[PDB]
């Protein structure tokens, strides 16, 4: 092989590169490049600190595109070896290469970004080095190029540098990262680039700065395009990102495509896919009635009821599935259809079951909120009674009220007291439900709740009592508990619900 010749050549070629004649520099740059193309002589170049330092200074300071291309090309080749990568680093190559990410030669940009890529992965010190040389700003600026292989390398450098570095995330945000990354997701079909870009947006999705910029750049809809891709890793990184973003996207429009796919993904064999879909749907159905309607239009109620059945005790599925059903069963034109659909798709038994152990407080709290909504539909009154909702709602209520007189699993018991009394307020619309509720000897507790300093507890207590006091026997029980005392104080409340309900109970107890 060459070997011998390569070594004797380097010393001369180094001197030629540092020459005044920019024609001699250029012919040297070309033969240096050519040597770098054979393993024999490539090892020669990497052994020579002076030669590598000469290549980095030529590239950085040349005006021949040919010698920019050739010198960068040489660094590309050196960067495939341990000796070469350390050489480039020690020769101050990282600042040089970052300068070359402003080149208006495509071959130079390619060689530059691949070299920095090999350094970021294979040379300790290079991540901090590239960051301090302003590599992020240069790389985000390059996200407007159109070569899918180049972009795949650029987005991969951005992911490496953004990961667990909150300054780099803010630099990517401040340089216009999110808009560029979203634009990639809705232009290119190249799986490696889409995947790498989805992984960048994932790192950024947990940053409370970037999160809203990604959503406003139209990132929900763009990531949405890819949820039915053949590539698992693409779909999964998109799902994870959407989940991270979803709580900031409740006010986005044009989300019908997404919501349709998420209802379809509830049916996945992969329980991770089902769980992310449930959580995203939970968030996007949060106070947005267009979303609530769209999810109902595409079989959402049935699909969620089936997720809850499928999930069993796995509370990571049931909590967001139940919150979604809760959001879908209230405050939108199709809330009444949904309340019926839960019953017709055999949801009521599983829903009432989830009020019991082993359910934890957050699921029980969501389940109470849902039962409260389901009970707005009169056709649910008897079914819910028959599944024993009422005695279990009263048992939760008493415990919460006893617990509050000294909270648990990241839920306030004051919150269980409101929910349960609210659900009982609505169920109490049915005369058979009222007989059961009275039968549990609850009127004394309801009256003590009128002494709660919490407006919302005052309102539901006065609420259920107002329903009970329809019937002579209850109106007499309520009066006998000295309810007129707190009720006439709640008369003069700033809260409309409280004062309106207080007045109703009082009227139903008067001469």
């Amino acid at each position: 092989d060459d070997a011998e010749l390569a070594t004797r050549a380097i010393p001369e070629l180094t001197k030629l590169l540092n020459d005044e004649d920019q024609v001699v520099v250029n012919k040297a740059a070309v033969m240096v490049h050519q040597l770098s193309k054979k393993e024999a002589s490539r090892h020669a170049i990497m052994r020579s600190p002076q030669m590598v330092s000469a290549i980095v200074r030529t590239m950085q300071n040349t005006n021949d595109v040919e010698t920019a291309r050739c010198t960068a090309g040489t660094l590309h080749n050196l960067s495939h070896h341990r000796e070469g990568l350390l050489a480039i680093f020690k020769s101050g190559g990282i600042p040089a290469l970052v300068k070359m990410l402003g080149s208006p030669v495509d071959s130079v940009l390619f060689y530059a970004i691949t070299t920095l890529h090999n350094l970021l992965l294979h040379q300790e010190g290079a991540k901090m080095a590239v960051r301090l040389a302003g590599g992020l700003q240069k790389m985000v600026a390059l996200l407007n190029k159109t070569n899918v292989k180049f972009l795949a390398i650029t987005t991969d450098c951005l992911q490496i540098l953004a990961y667990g570095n909150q300054e780099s995330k803010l630099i990517i945000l401040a340089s216009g990262g999110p808009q560029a990354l979203v634009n990639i997701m809705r232009t290119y079909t190249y799986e490696k680039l889409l995947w790498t870009t989805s992984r960048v947006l994932k790192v950024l999705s947990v940053c409370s700065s970037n999160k809203p910029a990604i959503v406003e750049a139209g990132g929900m809809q763009a990531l949405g395009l890819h949820l039915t891709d053949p590539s698992q890793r693409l779909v999964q990184n998109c799902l994870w990102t959407l989940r991270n973003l979803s709580d900031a996207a409740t006010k986005q429009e044009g989300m019908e495509g997404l919501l349709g796919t998420l209802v379809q993904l509830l049916g996945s064999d992969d329980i991770n896919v089902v769980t992310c879909a449930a959580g995203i749907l939970s968030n996007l159905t949060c106070n947005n009635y267009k979303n609530k309607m769209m999810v109902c239009q595409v079989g959402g109620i049935e699909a969620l009821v089936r997720t809850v059945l499928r999930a069993g005790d796995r509370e990571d599925i049931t909590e967001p599935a139940i919150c979604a059903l809760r959001h879908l069963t209230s405050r939108h034109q199709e809330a009444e259809m949904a309340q019926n659909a839960v019953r017709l798709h055999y949801g009521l038994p599983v829903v009432v079951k989830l009020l019991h152990p082993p359910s934890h407080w957050p699921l029980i709290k969501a389940t109470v909120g849902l039962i409260r909504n389901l009970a707005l539909c009169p056709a649910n009154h008897a079914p819910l009674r028959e599944q024993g909702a009422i005695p279990r709602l009263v048992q939760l209520l008493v415990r919460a009220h006893q617990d509050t007189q000294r909270f648990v699993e990241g839920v306030r018991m004051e919150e269980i007291v409101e929910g349960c009394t609210g659900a009982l307020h609505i169920l109490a619309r049915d005369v058979h439900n009222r007989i059961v509720i009275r039968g549990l000897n609850t009127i004394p507790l309801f009256v003590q709740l009128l002494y709660s300093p919490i407006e919302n507890i005052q309102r539901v207590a006065a609420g259920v009592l107002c329903e009970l006091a329809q019937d002579k026997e209850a109106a007499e029980a309520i009066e006998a508990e000295g309810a007129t005392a707190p009720l006439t104080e709640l008369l003069h409340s700033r809260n409309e619900g409280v004062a309106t309900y207080a007045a109703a109970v009082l009227f139903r107890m008067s001469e």
Partner: peptide, 16 residues
């Protein structure tokens, strides 16, 4: 991780 935030009648599960 996950944080629960009530938004009037409805709730948000904030996922990192």
């Amino acid at each position: 991780x996950v944080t629960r935030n009530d938004v009037x009648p409805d709730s948000l599960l904030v996922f990192x």
